[PDB]
Symmetry: C5
Subunit: 311 residues, 5 copies
């Protein structure tokens, strides 16, 4: 079979639409998500036209094999989509209405800069390669673009599913390619991070600061070192749920900065002891008293500065 | 092939039934479960009618390819079900009796609010898209809906497997869709959580309270900090077996609240030491004596309040 | 094709046999094992009968497509078995001898009560659905049931592979079903558990008891708390290699009970210190001296009681 | 199609050869490895013979479907090999030359007794089932057995790839089977184990022995207990990279024995303290002084004995 | 179908080109990467030639089945590539222009010597086996070799994608093979390693050196031992993200060397205490004062030497 012939030198417009049924498995480490949707295609093939009076029927159904169907592919998919044809319906003028149900593992990159308070735009790129007979251009039939109400992405809030109506037409290996951008806008459900990582991490830090109300070096060393190890465990736990980024993430910055607070606490604890031993407990008292205000104030201001830079 | 023709303007009724053989792999993190069942379908196709006298055979067997079979799909499956046709039997009036055995990874959401004392309703949604010739409606043949006695879901108790007999008939992309709801009611086997997480977690908390019967700051710091770290390990262990929820789970709440008890224990331990050093051991004694009653009482009441709010 | 016709109203007997080639991947958490075996089937089809004198040949070979083959399925498999036909041989009387090589992930439940000193009976269930023409019954050809000498299941000892010769004949969805039970009896190789979990766990417990020969509260607190944390690590490591059971496992019981010993050791250590501080070291001495005998004796008796209840 | 007819009563010899292209994924826990190789088969079928003068051609190419091909299977594979036919070439005498490229996950057991200083013999078993017409026997064409120079198995050294030329001819399910043994001899690259596990483990042990130059019980308890926990982490890390064996591995033995050294160090530390408190520091001094020599000497001799027993 | 006939004794040139669409999943442990690309092939088949005047058309399209297509395989792939034909176009002279879109898991080894400051050259090897009719040689059509601008490999920077234009022509199993080398040059994004592993690891080391400004043995033992354990956790974390190499990696060397610094710190701490107890605090003071300069200086020089040897 060959593509439909042009009335003039115009390209063939394949109207598209994606309707999400199930949306799942957003892997932050892999920057992938799995989708299960309907793909609808519509184009005019004058060769398929018929008189409804003479033929009796208003529409004719065909098996994929019988007629010409445009080779539509997804750009950012991992492996080729699993698709099963639901229906192919031809109207008297020759307008074909194709429908298939597919599933694919889509590879769309993520911006972890504001993690876990981040919002993402997932992409689904539809593409078509022009044949030698005629050039093929994609379009968006907005009435056939949507999502089911039940569509839930675990740990995420689905904001919108829209399509950038004007395709990206470009040359590739000396043939026209018409690319379409379907955008799924989502925002992370940060709630869990608060009682599981953020608040536990702040509690262990504040426990390290109880060393500023203690003259016992042995007890201080235990307080600051033990809590530093729990902070290492939280740093490791966090960096496992995330990929290696060439930029600093919000949680990454807080986690990093907190190491400096532990390092300075060890220095203060060491200075206090050295001074007490050197028979200068009055000077050690001044430093310890100052640290009680300095540490919370510098922590609070540094955090205001960070939140400002990141948001 | 085309769908059966109507006697009048009636829709075509496809009678359904699911009989679970094997039920397994309930992933709490993924909110998926795997199923291995029988799918039975039955509809009348007058075109397949035959005389048993002339044909020799009461029933005729056909290969799926030979006749028209309704395109029945599952809504909430991950990938398309793996199915193998067991039998297709046609009676002289044209009544088709389809049987297939399938396996699928079903995606049904879970409510972790009362975890690990939670009960779930897993869903299996059957659907059918109406063709242009005639509208297709699903039905439940209750005699062909059930589960095997051997059906075991590891770490869960299977309560019931029933079907909501009235289908959800709705419009989708300008065609009628007939959806059916099969519900598998299950309840978690919480027993293992008690000797593995709950009791170990309470033992480490009570060990931290032995600091209220000790004047040794160095020993108290070790007691409260060491047990706090074991609590962090239990928090990490628990949050690995669960997905990130936008709500507080029962175990999540207890785990969180216990951090506050560790934080207040560190404050008491610090106050006691400061006072002893400041040569006020009488005042430190009053606080320590009070804490011995306060901590268990406040822990017990807070837990009564939590159990009340959650159950 | 249709099933063989009966001489009288007798059912069709399909003689079966499974011969294990490779047995592997026993997942304790999933309660699954992978198998790679031969499946032999034998039944009489008089339509296939031939005279060896006239035909010249003693046996005739056929492709599966050419003749009727009973639809034999496995009940407790995860997905449908991967099978490849080795041979189909027909004798002059019409006796068909089918052979196929298959692989499947079998889902047979396990009893962890005596873990890691447990023995299991893995099951492979063969089933057949009766057709409308005639009822099909399964049988065991014991000469075609066995296992290869090389068959090794890592971390397990394979005791026997036998079949319960009388099939379970029952009604299902208004048709007769003939189920057969193939039993693979295995017993766990507990040896590794001794130097890796049991002995390390006992050593850390005995180290905690060196606190009964020490008057240093700070040292005792360190001894009992540090070793309690190592016991938590062993509890976590053990519960990862096992699924969540609604019953107590042998190792689970020992692990749980050892927590009580740590809890009572903390109480003794606390009492000794309180008494020493209260200027009653004589009474603290009596308690410490008693604990030296009490702890090992109660540990040894409690273990005799547990081993008795479990074995 | 039927097998080639015999000139006399001789069996049909299928000459074989395996040429490894890619060798990868050696799973120690699973005792599997993945292979990607060429399988070459050669047998004489007189029915395919032709005159090169009359036919013009020197060799004839055939599609697998066109001619009889022996059903060659792998014994110790997990699932059936993925194979794609490269070429089928017939010479004038009827000698068929088959070539296919395959990939399979091979299940060959491993001997961890000398781990990580172990050497293995991986096996690839080729087999063929005799048909009723005539018996089929395998052979090794040594010119068609080899491996690519690039063949690399990560963390292993590939020593040799040879075949045991005489097949194992035996009865199975009342038919003759001809098995062939292809052996891949490999040896572990132990280098990484030295700076990552062995030396770190020895350093922590030697740190525990600094307690023999200290009179501080509180410091000794910390030294011996802390280092014992790091040893537990190394034991856990090691037993994760390995399966549960019914025998003692070399690293397993060293790891186990080191626990005894920690246990005796705790006893010495306890004895020294008891004696110092009992006002017998002279006797405690003798024991501590002796331990300084005893511990390294007994450690060094015990290791000589172990290396001797294992190698 | 047979291969194209030669004009003379020349070999058949198959012009190739790979255009990367999606590049993903670089597994450091497995030394694999997944690719999703276009594979373009071009060769002349005079049998397919036509007159554009007489035929009307300028190019003719064919289904793969209709014409002869060279059997092109990938050498270093894990399993056979998943490919789907985009287009086959024949020009009047008989020049065939094949295009397919494929996906494969490529196995190309990595050099971890400079990790995480390493650069890699990933390889994609195209190969072709000569048939008996005529020898087949590969070529690189540079206009059909490239990569998409969007091509992103998580945690890596893609430098170049080029092809070594001269094929490696060699004999294999008595037939000519033409191999082509496609090279993807990438360099690791080391940024994340600095705040997550390197700086945390240096902070814990510097904390251990605060023991040179402390006379408290109990406190020093805690400081050096606690920080040594955190270093063990970082060593474990690092060796999990990497395979077992028969050489020393850059991070491996630093991590190893840091153990020696901990070991010497324990010796100093032990010597200081022994001397203080032996009533020689003046000599212990000299050693402690020297260590304050020695440790940072030796650490800094040793690191200069390592960076020099590795870069
Ligand atoms: C004579 C002292 C007996 C102590 C018994 C404690 C039993 C606690 C049972 C908990 C069950 C769940 C709640 C934690 C209490 C810690 C006990 C501290 C004991 C101090 C003793 C002082 C010496 C006079
Ligand atoms: C704390 C220390 C815990 C030690 C547990 C001892 C093992 C035990 O008592 O295990 C019990 C098993 C029983 O094996 P069975 O064949 O199933 O006996 C079934 C008997 N009936 C059918 C009569 C009920 O004996 C063994 O394997 C003994 C060897 C293991 C010794 C390990 C010691 C360390
Ligand atoms: Cl696609
Ligand atoms: Cl362009
Ligand atoms: Cl174009
Ligand atoms: Cl489905
Ligand atoms: Cl099956
Ligand atoms: Cl095979
Ligand atoms: Cl390939
Ligand atoms: Na088509
Ligand atoms: Na059909
Ligand atoms: Na059949
Ligand atoms: Na301590
Ligand atoms: Na064949
Ligand atoms: Na072809």
């Amino acid at each position: 079979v060959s593509p439909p012939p042009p009335i003039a030198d115009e390209p063939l417009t394949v109207n598209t639409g994606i309707y999400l049924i199930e949306c799942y498995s957003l892997d932050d480490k892999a920057e992938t998500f799995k989708v299960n949707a309907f793909l609808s295609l519509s184009w005019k093939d004058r060769r398929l036209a018929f008189d409804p009076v003479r033929s009796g029927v208003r529409v004719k159904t065909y098996e994929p094999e019988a007629i010409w169907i445009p080779e539509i592919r997804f750009v950012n998919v991992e492996n080729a989509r699993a698709a099963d044809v639901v229906d192919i319906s031809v109207s008297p003028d020759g307008t074909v209405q194709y429908l298939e149900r597919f599933s694919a593992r889509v590879l769309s990159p993520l911006d972890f800069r504001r993690y876990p308070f981040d919002s993402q735009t997932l992409h689904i790129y539809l593409i078509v390669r022009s044949v030698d007979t005629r050039n093929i251009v994609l379009a968006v039939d907005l009435e056939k673009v949507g999502k089911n109400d039940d569509v839930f992405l675990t740990g995420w809030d689905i904001e919108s599913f829209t399509a950038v109506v004007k395709p990206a037409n470009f040359a590739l290996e000396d043939r026209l390619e018409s690319k379409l951008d379907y955008q799924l806008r989502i925002s992370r459900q940060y709630f869990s991070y608060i009682p599981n990582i953020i608040l536990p991490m702040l509690f262990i830090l504040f426990i390290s600061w109880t060393a500023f109300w203690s003259t016992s070096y042995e007890a201080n060393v235990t307080l600051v070192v033990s809590t530093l190890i729990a902070h290492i465990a939280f740093n490791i736990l966090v960096e496992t749920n995330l990929p290696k980024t060439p930029y600093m993430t919000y949680t990454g910055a807080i986690i990093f900065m907190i190491y400096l607070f532990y390092f300075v606490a060890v220095i203060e604890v060491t200075v206090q002891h050295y001074l007490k031993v050197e028979s200068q407990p009055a000077r050690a008292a001044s430093i310890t008293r100052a640290s009680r205000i300095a540490f919370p104030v510098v922590f609070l201001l540094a955090n205001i500065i960070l939140a400002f830079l990141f948001f």
